[PDB]
From a paper:
To understand how L-fucose so ably blocks the CRD of CL-11 and thereby prevents CL-11 binding to relevant ligands, e.g., oligomannose- or complex-type glycan ligands that can occur at N-glycosylation sites of the spike protein, we examined the crystal structure of complexes formed between the CRD of CL-11 and L-fucose (30). Density for fucose was observed in the primary binding site of each CRD. Unexpectedly, density for a second fucose occurred in the adjacent subsite of one of the CRDs, forming hydrogen bonds with the side chains of Glu244 and Arg200 and packing against the side chain of Arg229. Here, we show in complexes formed between the CRD of CL-11 and L-fucose that the carbohydrate-binding site is occupied by two such monosaccharides, the second L-fucose unusually occupying the framework structure of the CRD away from the Ca2+-binding site containing the first L-fucose. This unexpected feature of L-fucose interacting with both subsites of CL-11 justifies the use of L-fucose to block CL-11 binding both to natural oligomannose or complex fucosylated ligands that may be present on SARS-CoV-2 and injured RECs.
Of particular interest is the pattern-recognition molecule collectin-11 (CL-11), whose structure resembles the better known C-type lectin mannose-binding lectin (MBL), but which differs because it is produced ubiquitously at epithelial surfaces including the respiratory tract whereas MBL is exclusively expressed in hepatocytes and the circulation. The fundamental subunit of CL-11 includes a carbohydrate-recognition domain (CRD) and a collagen-like domain (CLD). These subunits combine to form multivalent trimers and multiples of trimers with potential for cross-linking carbohydrate ligands, typically fucosylated glycans and high-mannose oligosaccharides.
Author numbering: 146 to 271
Write the structure that this text describes.
């Protein structure tokens, strides 16, 4: 795991679709991880890369309104982002969920893709 002053991050090495990944994180007491700042973002990227992975699902999506991205707590995307160049490109009009790659950058992908995923937990809830 990884643990900051306020959050715990957990990499779950089970291949799931985005929605199953989110429900798994919720049942574990949290949510898909939400990189809202540089510290959290780099921490998640270092974690998945240390585990030998190329990508994981994180908690960002534009499922409800195309092009309106939100975190897994439904709060909106703010000024901070780590989109790779040209992303989010809604490729083939079917990309509504977000992967983080080992560099730390973000790419939108189809939500019916399967991959490992990262949860985040608030320590006041744990
Ligand atoms: C209360 C402390 O909180 C964070 O700073 C962590 O680095 C430690 O593991 C400890 O749990
Ligand atoms: C292989 C494809 O390459 C780019 O178009 C990305 O924007 C897509 O999401 C996908 O990764
Ligand atoms: C590792 C990265 O994964 C993403 O899905 C791709 O879109 C990028 O080109 C890159 O290969
Ligand atoms: Ca869409
Ligand atoms: Ca989209
Ligand atoms: Ca994309």
């Amino acid at each position: 795991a990884r643990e900051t002053e306020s959050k715990i991050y957990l990499l779950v090495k089970e291949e799931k679709r985005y929605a199953d990944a989110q429900l798994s994180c919720q049942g574990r007491g949290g949510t898909l991880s939400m990189p809202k700042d540089e510290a959290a973002n780099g921490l998640m990227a270092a974690y998945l890369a240390q585990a030998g992975l190329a990508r994981v699902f994180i908690g960002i999506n534009d499922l409800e309104k195309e092009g309106a991205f939100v975190y897994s707590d439904h709060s909106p995307m703010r000024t901070f982002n780590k989109w790779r160049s040209g992303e989010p490109n809604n490729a083939y009009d079917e990309e509504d969920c977000v992967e983080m790659v080992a560099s730390g950058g973000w790419n939108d992908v189809a939500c019916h893709t399967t991959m490992y995923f990262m949860c985040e937990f608030d320590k006041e809830n744990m």
